[PDB]
Each structure stands twice: as C-alpha cells, then as structure tokens.
Structure 1
Amino acid sequence: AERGELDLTGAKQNTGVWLVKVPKYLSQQWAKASGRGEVGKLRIAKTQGRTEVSFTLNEDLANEHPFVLQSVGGQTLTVFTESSSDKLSLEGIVVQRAECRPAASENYMRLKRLQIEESSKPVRLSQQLDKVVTTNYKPVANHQYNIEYERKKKEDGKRARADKQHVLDMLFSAFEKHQYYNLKDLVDITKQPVVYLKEILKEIGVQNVKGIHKNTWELKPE
C-alpha cells in the first residue's frame, strides 16, 4: 500500500481491452449519453471470409457507424489507471484497436458544415471599428500624482530626533542578525534624515565598501 505502487492484476490476469477511435462530433453526441451513459448498441457479423462490426446510435442519442479494425502489432499496448484516490492500477492489455468511420451517409458538404459549425468564430480578423475618436479627458492634475497626494498628506519622513537612544537599541536588534548592513537598509529601519543617521553610524561604528563599493556599516568590534 503506497502511492507509487502499481497494481499489476489486469496484466497478470491477461485482461484484454478494445481500442476504438471516434470522431469528435460523434464524441460530442456521446457526451450527451442517454440515461446513465448508454449511447447505443454494437452489431457484429462474422462470415467465412468477411467480418463486419458496426455501432448504431441510441434513438435518444439520435435526437450506422462501421468500425475499421487496426493492427496493434509492432507495439504492445496496455491500459493503466489513476483513481480519484490516486491509487494506481493496470486494468489490462489491449487486444484490439479500431476506428469509427462514415459510410454511405455523407460526401463532404455536411462535414464542411460540421467544421464550420464547430468554429463559430471571427478567427480574430479585424472587422473594422469603422471610425471613432475616443479622445481622453484632461484631469487638471495627474491622477496617480493626485492618488499619490492622498497618501502623501497622511505622513511625512520629516520626523523628530528624540532618539539618541531608541535607534541604537534597534541597532542591536538588526546587527544581531548580521554583522553588517547596507546604508539604505539602515535608512529603512530609521525614520530620520540620512545625514543625522550618518552622525549615528559614525558614533558607534565605521563602514565599508565590503568589496562591493556600497556604503555598508557595522558595529565596532572594539
């Protein structure tokens, strides 16, 4: 009992299955399967030198498809499953392949219509516009700038310096995570002018290029 475990029962039972190719329009008729899922009935006639299989649509499904049998030789085919409980199972080995084809029921016109019917689209072609002039309103002030304004008026970066103390305490917190930080990142924790900040970082630390040019600051090892 494991997710990657495949049931081999079908194969080991030598279970056989049949494979049939079916056109989409018929398959679209089949998605409307009558009742629980019945679509019709299959008829099989075998003779001493001729074998005929065909399928006939359910009268409900209607509101003859001959089969062409194909070889499965050259490539062994088996069917394997994935449950809705994600369990894996091998149901069987393919003992027959076949294709559903039209017979004496159509030349081309309906198929052409069927193709047309499936489409029902303008392919994407540019069908005019004909002519318009959707000129764009002047908003007396830049909208986003204006939107910026509602936000801007709420708070300023021009804050006070009652902190020749609260900022150093915060410095212990940051530098506890890493020895050195970028000046912009130091600016992010702070709410004070960089020049004032520069005065602080000079006071308890020095700085680097860290081999990356960037003004990176750290606490004094001494």
Structure 2
Amino acid sequence: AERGELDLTGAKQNTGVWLVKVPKYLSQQWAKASGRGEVGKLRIAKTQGRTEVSFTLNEDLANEHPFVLQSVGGQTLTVFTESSSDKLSLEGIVVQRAECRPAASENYMRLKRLQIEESSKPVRLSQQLDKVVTTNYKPVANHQYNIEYERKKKEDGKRARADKQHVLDMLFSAFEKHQYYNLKDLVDITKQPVVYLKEILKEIGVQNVKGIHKNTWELKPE
C-alpha cells in the first residue's frame, strides 16, 4: 500500500466494459448540456443466430445510430483511472469494441461540410488591398524608443568620481566575494569612470593572463 500502488480490484472481479467509437457531433450534442444526466438509450436486439446493436438520439438532444461490433481477440485492452487524490485504480477489462455510423448518407455529408468549413475559419488567407498602405514610416518628430533611452541616460546623469579612499574600500570589500573580476563587470559594481577606475586598479591591482577565456584583472595587488 503506497501512493504508486494500483488498485487492481477491478481486474480481480473480471468486470467487462465496451469500447465505442462515436463521431464528434453526437458527443458535441452531449457536451452542449453535459449535465442533465441523460443523452439517449442504448438498445440491443438479439436473434437466434444474430445480434444487432443500435442507439437512438434523445428527442430533446436533437432539437438512428446503428452500432457495428469488432473483434477484440487481436488486442487486449484494459481501462484504468487516476484519482485526483493520487489513487490509481483499474475500472475493468474491455470485452467488446463497437463503432457508430450515420443512418443518413446524402444529407449527412452536408453536416460534415459545415464542420470542414467551420474548421476552416482559423485558416487565414492573404487579403487583396484596394489602396496601397500609406501609414508606414508615417511622420514622427522622434521615434518613441529614442526619447525613452535618451531621457533615461539624462536622468541617470553622471558617474561621479568618488574619493580614491571610498573607491578603494569598495574594491577591497567586493574582492572577498570572488577572486577575480572583469573590468566591465567591476565598473558596474564600483560605478566609477573607466579611465579613473583603471588608474586606481593599476595603482594596486594587476592583470593576469588566463589561458581559458582571456587576460583579466586580479584584485590582489600581489
């Protein structure tokens, strides 16, 4: 007994179930209400040496479905369900397979044609355009992206050169986090001018040639 255990009780009882193939319109009508608890009646008629299966559509639902059985000896089928509470169980074993066919032949294709046309609605096609489009590259005093970026740079303003002591303290404090830093990445952390930062870094720091990516600055003066 565990979460992954399968409740194989249905197999023990050898419960039999029927697998039925039905078209979409029959199920679509059921899906319309799908909560009235009734969609039709399944009638089975048996004779001395012949059995026939047929289904009748509900009168309210509409506002004959002959059934053909199929051999199940070529493949063994079982039905299982997964509970929302993580408790899998086996409903039973399929004992017969059936298929549903339309009683009508001529006007039935008309319904199918509507479905094919209906499923063709998302099929987008190129549209002829009477007048050439004149709204492209239409007059703008400035592109919106240009004003946004320029405004941001102006607001963010200037990278102040802090007193060497403050810059040095920040550099040494950040050195503990990692052994080596990239010049570009170090600039963001220190937020100082590249030329000014390089001069400070040169005064104490040095760059070591690394054969894996490239020569990078090392915060350790020695």
Determine if the TM-score, normalized by the shorter chain, exceeds 0.5.
yes
In the alignment, the residues of structure 2 paired with residue 137 and residue 118 of structure 1 have an alpha-carbon distance, to the nearest angstrom, of: 38
Say whether the 8 Å CA contact 1:33–1:39 is kept in structure 2: no
2:120 aligned with 1:120: yes
CA deviation after TM superposition for structure 1 residue 78, in Å = 0.3
Structure 1 window deviating more from structure 2 (89-98 vs 137-146): it is 137-146
Distance 1:149 1:125, change over 3 A: closer
CA deviation after TM superposition for structure 1 residue 95, in Å = 0.9
Say whether the 8 Å CA contact 1:71–1:96 is kept in structure 2: yes
Which is helix-richer, 1 or 2?
2
Distance 1:97 1:145, change over 3 A: closer
Aligned pairs, how many?
Answer: 222
In the alignment, the residues of structure 2 paired with residue 134 and residue 5 of structure 1 have an alpha-carbon distance, to the nearest angstrom, of: 67
Distance 1:156 1:26, change over 3 A: closer
SS in structure 1 at match of 2:60: coil
CA deviation after TM superposition for structure 1 residue 204, in Å = 2.4
CA deviation after TM superposition for structure 1 residue 40, in Å = 0.5
CA deviation after TM superposition for structure 1 residue 58, in Å = 1.3
Distance 1:154 1:62, change over 3 A: same
Distance 1:158 1:33, change over 3 A: closer
Structure 1 runs of 4+ with >6 Å offset: none
Unaligned runs of 5+ in 1: none
Distance 1:156 1:124, change over 3 A: closer
Say whether the 8 Å CA contact 1:22–1:99 is kept in structure 2: yes
In the alignment, the residues of structure 1 paired with residue 139 and residue 110 of structure 2 have an alpha-carbon distance, to the nearest angstrom, of: 57
CA deviation after TM superposition for structure 1 residue 72, in Å = 1.4
SS in structure 1 at match of 2:19: strand
Structure 1 window deviating more from structure 2 (55-64 vs 106-115): it is 106-115
Distance 1:173 1:157, change over 3 A: farther
Distance 1:122 1:17, change over 3 A: closer
Structure 1 window deviating more from structure 2 (163-172 vs 49-58): it is 163-172
Task: Map Cα deviations across residues 180-220 of structure 1 (whole Å, 9 max, x no partner).
Answer: 11111111112222111111111221112322564411222
Say whether the 8 Å CA contact 1:20–1:99 is kept in structure 2: yes
Unaligned runs of 5+ in 2: none
Distance 1:105 1:33, change over 3 A: farther
SS in structure 1 at match of 2:107: coil
Task: Map Cα deviations across residues 100-143 of structure 1 (whole Å, 9 max, x no partner).
Answer: 01235646543443434543527322232233322335555441
Distance 1:59 1:107, change over 3 A: closer
Distance 1:196 1:81, change over 3 A: same
Task: Map Cα deviations across residues 137-170 of structure 1 (whole Å, 9 max, x no partner).
Answer: 5555441454235534543563332331222222
The alignment's TM-score, normalised by the length of structure 2, stands at 0.85
**Structure 1 vs Structure 2 CA RMSD:** 2.6
In the alignment, the residues of structure 2 paired with residue 157 and residue 213 of structure 1 have an alpha-carbon distance, to the nearest angstrom, of: 33
CA deviation after TM superposition for structure 1 residue 43, in Å = 0.7
Say whether the 8 Å CA contact 2:204–2:221 is kept in structure 1: no
Task: Map Cα deviations across residues 88-109 of structure 1 (whole Å, 9 max, x no partner).
Answer: 1111111111000123564654
Say whether the 8 Å CA contact 2:206–2:221 is kept in structure 1: no
Distance 1:117 1:124, change over 3 A: closer
Say whether the 8 Å CA contact 1:158–1:193 is kept in structure 2: no
Distance 1:107 1:140, change over 3 A: closer
Distance 1:52 1:16, change over 3 A: same
SS in structure 2 at match of 1:31: helix
Structure 1 window deviating more from structure 2 (146-155 vs 15-24): it is 146-155
